[PDB]
Design a protein around this ligand. Structure first.
Ligand SMILES: CCS(=O)(=O)Nc1ccc(Oc2ccc(F)cc2F)c(-c2cn(C)c(=O)c3[nH]ccc23)c1
Ligand SMILES: CCS(=O)(=O)Nc1ccc(Oc2ccc(F)cc2F)c(-c2cn(C)c(=O)c3[nH]ccc23)c1
Lengths: 111, 111
């Protein structure tokens, strides 16, 4: 129920999402989506603001998050990016869901 | 794009969350959490802002959502209260995630 200890909580969420525990679904989000390499046609038109956990990690370490709601919007932006671009039956879409399940729960248990 | 079209889409989201299709996990969220009746100790302590689909439905019928974000914020709040109050291995937590999956996806597919 404070900023400095809430941001601590979000750091906690970040570490969990990046831990070896969640590696088998989390791995597409470790780094910025490489649209060229993966052949994602029009990825940069369809997707206004890219976001991944490495970006989130950086703003966290440089202390660029002013509050928790902001952390949240970036994390959800990252998943929404995935859901927007991809067909519902896409493998990565299932993976976004499983990681987001982890996100939403620990985020709900915030002070 | 603009608020009018977005909200139309949001209502269609709501409709889907209320349809028969999702009924076997959706049903806990149809109405406000009756803390008394379910014997949820301290629910109103723990949960500052109750939210359910009837409250969302009402605001939509009444045109009380100014933009799509405001719809998202209520629907996520409804899920968040669930994950906040309950233990992780609660049936209702499992049902929330299954419905949220339907929310997050179709919401990401907004024009
Ligand atoms: C670490 C960033 S990376 O770019 O360097 N590597 C990378 C590698 C595989 C990926 O996808 C798959 C994942 C899991 C599978 F089982 C199959 C996949 F194809 C994606 C990926 C990410 N996201 C957010 C998408 O929306 C998306 N759409 C289409 C691909 C993707 C990114
Ligand atoms: C809609 C009017 S109602 O709200 O009054 N009815 C109602 C009935 C059952 C419920 O839960 C169950 C779920 C799945 C089962 F298999 C068994 C259950 F009992 C909940 C329920 C809701 N929510 C948001 C919670 O956070 C929560 N925590 C503990 C219970 C709940 C609410």
């Amino acid at each position: 129920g404070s900023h400095s200890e809430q941001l601590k909580h979000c750091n906690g969420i970040l570490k969990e999402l990046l831990s070896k525990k969640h590696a088998a679904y989390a791995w597409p989000f470790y780094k910025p989506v490489d649209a060229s390499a993966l052949g994602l046609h029009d990825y940069h038109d369809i997707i206004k603001h890219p976001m991944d956990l490495s970006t989130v990690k950086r703003k966290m370490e440089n202390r660029d998050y002013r509050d928790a709601q902001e952390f949240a919007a970036d994390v959800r932006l990252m998943f929404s990016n995935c859901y927007k671009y991809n067909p519902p039956d896409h493998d990565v879409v299932a993976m976004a869901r499983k990681l987001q399940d982890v996100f939403e729960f620990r985020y709900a248990k915030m002070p």
